[PDB]
Nucleic acid binder design. Sequence first.
DNA 1: TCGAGAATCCCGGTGCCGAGGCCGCTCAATTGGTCGTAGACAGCTCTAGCACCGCTTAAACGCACGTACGCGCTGTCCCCCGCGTTTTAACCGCCAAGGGGATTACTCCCTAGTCTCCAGGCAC
Lengths: 102, 79, 79, 87, 106, 93
Amino acid sequence: QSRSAKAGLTFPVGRVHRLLRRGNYAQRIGSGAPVYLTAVLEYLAAEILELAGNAARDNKKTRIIPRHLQLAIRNDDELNKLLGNVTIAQGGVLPNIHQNLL
Amino acid sequence: DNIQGITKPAIRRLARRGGVKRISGLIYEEVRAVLKSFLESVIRDSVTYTEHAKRKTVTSLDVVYALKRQGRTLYGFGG
Amino acid sequence: DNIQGITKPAIRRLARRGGVKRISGLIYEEVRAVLKSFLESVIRDSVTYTEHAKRKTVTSLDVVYALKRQGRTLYGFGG
Amino acid sequence: LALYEIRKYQRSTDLLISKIPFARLVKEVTDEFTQDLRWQSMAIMALQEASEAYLVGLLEHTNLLALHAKRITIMKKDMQLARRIRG
Amino acid sequence: VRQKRREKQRKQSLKRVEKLALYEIRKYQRSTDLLISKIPFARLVKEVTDEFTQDLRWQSMAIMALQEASEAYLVGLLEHTNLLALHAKRITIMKKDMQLARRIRG
Amino acid sequence: RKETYSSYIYKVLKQTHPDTGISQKSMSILNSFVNDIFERIATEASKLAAYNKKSTISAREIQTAVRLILPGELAKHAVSEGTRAVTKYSSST
DNA sequence: TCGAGAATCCCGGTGCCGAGGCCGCTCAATTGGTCGTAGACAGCTCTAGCACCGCTTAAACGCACGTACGCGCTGTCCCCCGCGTTTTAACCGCCAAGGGGATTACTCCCTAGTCTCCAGGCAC
């Protein structure tokens, strides 16, 4: 019985606890810690995959491309607060012609 | 010369990606100079990474670590 | 009422300290607005720090660590 | 008398903005965000210094933005595009 | 040489089928791929690495990531200088416009 | 043979929206993003642990780190998901 | 005018390379008895912020000369730009050498743990 099947988790909570142990970060890791790490990573993954599913829905393509992920990460102010500095490979840029040139 | 390999219509298409109506003839040399400066500023760290590692291949892991060190992190090539 | 804790000649003398001579009338209200939006994140991060410290008084080391996390490191108040 | 105050406030390397109205302002924002919290005066003067540095950086960024648009008096749009290169 | 025959067939298919500046702005804003010619950029980064080198090798994906990051930084600086250009009542940009954004960022 | 989240990303994709396909480069971008936010929350949790005399990383350290990094709606939904999963874990051992 | 025959629009068949699934598997995930060690609470003090105001006190609020210049209009003037035309090297395919990356590990060498003796270091 793994620690993931004790809470319905899918992200590898035992592996994550192992990388926190043998990963030059801290000394002790509580039992309530890596299930919560698995929880917040699962929430972030569910948010970005739902945004990618919407981006695949409204763009009539049944697959996930990096342009869809770039339009996911750049058209949300919470995602511009979180990851407004990093970029996506082959993601392109935001199509926004300014009003003064129009 | 290899600094003029990125020619005038290349920077024109880059500006049309960035949304410019009309551009001037003084832009291209300063664009190439700031591109050489940014390339030097990332390549110095990216080659000190591969010079410490007893290697001669500038690996993609080394350039994404050097990009993460200098703020502008990429996704997909490690990390 | 503490939203007007700063005054207009104070912003004028701060502009003379920097180099801004001619000031518009909207600049003081926009400075109050950008001060409002600037202090709020660091102060609520210090509230999160004090909640991590589970006390009432906000200690100075929590302020230094909050300004270090925000990217506005201050020298002289810790270490 | 234009160069008088520029050579006065810059050479005097002390603070210029208030302390106790800033204490009232930080009490106001902790009443907005938190429950009253006691505040060390070193933390209040550290917030004062950080606000001063952020403001002088914003004004020294808009200084050349004023002369860029053939102006001298800074405008409200100057505190709308200097934030674009400040995050 | 079946790969050569397939390449000639694809080249023939591209030659037969695939073969007021306001359109290019909205055209190149929805493009996703790279826009810098590859092997002159590789020769340029080979010349840049010759200043800080020894026969240092190069993986191809590293030069691809470098081209992507440099294109991203250039379009970021260009998108930031367009606002300062139109702020100074200039539809046409100038080298003075790419001096303040190169100054106030650091 | 590297410990990759790829099968887990496809698994959590197949629960809410199974109609969308996933490529290779986009999946590697997702894996690098989740590893980046994982190491960011790891170093922030280790930093907050080494701040105020608590070497054991409990749920308190990482909930303070989640409240620290994320914006308000994101930290609210993240602390909701984390409290839900920690009750489901501490209840079912 | 009938009809047979050639051309084309639209409908049906088929490569094809990327997404999806799968058998074999093999160093990690689980649980466990234990065990030195973090750590949470509490008397108790001590110490830093808060209010009132004694006593002054520069400084902001706001209105009045006045002229510098932001915005808009008018004329100027020229420099990138669309377009045509000529050149040119990028991409692709392919032949070829070979060179560092990757994987295995052993003596040796440098470190965790151990106790023992001494010279730093802010307080009086």
